[PDB]
Design a binder for this molecule. Structure first.
Ligand code: HEM
Length: 289
């Protein structure tokens, strides 16, 4: 299956920067969400989940078609809680009805990462909404209760290697788990993007406990937690090397996350040779807004 990026008619960097700005200004305004975490983390997770349905074998799923708008996908148990991100983005879509759904969802993740002081993430336009019958079935997103071998194999489907998987996982510095969404509870409640996932993995005293949903998770006294799949990055020697690297080099982590996240958001998309170059949006702060 081939999905060719098609630029929204007549649109250019300036149009997309205004969408970015509207998302960013709303992230600033709507501060109270999730006990003052704000919407940044959930938008990152949304961008990931709409992309992470991709299957490299047949080019089904992926961000291109915007299929999260359809009930089958919206209602995936793996997507529980992301409705909050969708409802955040609805007034943005109303204001900018010309942007495709996949472009909006992926741009929301870009904007969130950058506004939370993360790396710049180059972003390309041209995802085109596809029909309801193109929505992938539930079950393509990963389980949390599994080991390193499961994560490694899982991510081969999305054409990600060890370094890319460890880099992407660093997003688990953001936000928190919520028992009623996923059967996991806790976390740092952070809304600043840094390399502290890796630091926490290496430096905290972790205890394997059962939560109130009867699932195991790793907890520290400071209030941090790790899923079994997170903790697996220090139980596999290949992953552990990379965790140590990123714990010790903020800039390297930023650069590798940026590359991996862009790739995630673009898997499945064919960009014509004369497509615009990737856009790098200015933050509100950089614009003096
Ligand atoms: C093995 C892979 C992964 C698994 C099993 C996993 C699982 C989870 C679970 C169970 C939650 C909690 C959801 C809730 O209760 O609200 C969560 C949250 C989150 N995940 Fe992941 N995830 C994975 C990879 C990723 C990746 C690759 C990214 C993005 C680059 C991502 C970004 C996030 C973010 C930002 C949150 C916090 C959401 C919030 O605070 O509402 N995750 N993930």
């Amino acid at each position: 299956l081939v999905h060719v990026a098609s630029v929204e008619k007549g649109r250019s960097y300036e149009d997309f920067q205004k969408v970015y700005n509207a998302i960013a200004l709303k992230l600033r305004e709507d501060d109270e969400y999730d006990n003052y975490i704000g919407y940044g983390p959930v938008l990152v997770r949304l961008a990931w989940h709409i992309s992470g349905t991709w299957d490299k074998h047949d080019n089904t799923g992926g961000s291109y078609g915007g299929t999260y708008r359809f009930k089958k996908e919206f209602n995936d148990p793996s997507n529980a809680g992301l409705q909050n991100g969708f409802k955040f983005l609805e007034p943005i879509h109303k204001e900018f009805p010309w942007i495709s759904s996949g472009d909006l969802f992926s741009l929301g993740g870009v904007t969130a990462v950058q506004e939370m002081q993360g790396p710049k993430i180059p972003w390309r336009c041209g995802r085109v909404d596809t029909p309801e019958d193109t929505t992938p079935d539930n079950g393509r997103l990963p389980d949390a209760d599994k080991d390193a071998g499961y994560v490694r194999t899982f991510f081969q489907r999305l054409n990600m290697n060890d370094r890319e998987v460890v880099a992407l996982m660093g997003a688990h510095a953001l936000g928190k788990t919520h028992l009623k969404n996923s059967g996991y509870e806790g976390g740092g409640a952070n809304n600043v993007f840094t390399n502290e996932f890796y630091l926490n993995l290496l430096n905290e005293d972790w205890k394997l406990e059962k939560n109130d949903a009867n699932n195991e998770q790793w907890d520290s006294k400071s209030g941090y937690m790790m899923l079994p799949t997170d903790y697996s990055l220090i139980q596999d020697p290949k992953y552990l090397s990379i965790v140590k690297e990123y714990a010790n080099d903020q800039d390297k982590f930023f650069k590798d996350f940026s590359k991996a996240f862009e790739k995630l958001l673009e898997n499945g998309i064919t960009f014509p040779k004369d497509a615009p170059s990737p856009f790098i949006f200015k933050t509100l702060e950089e614009q003096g807004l």
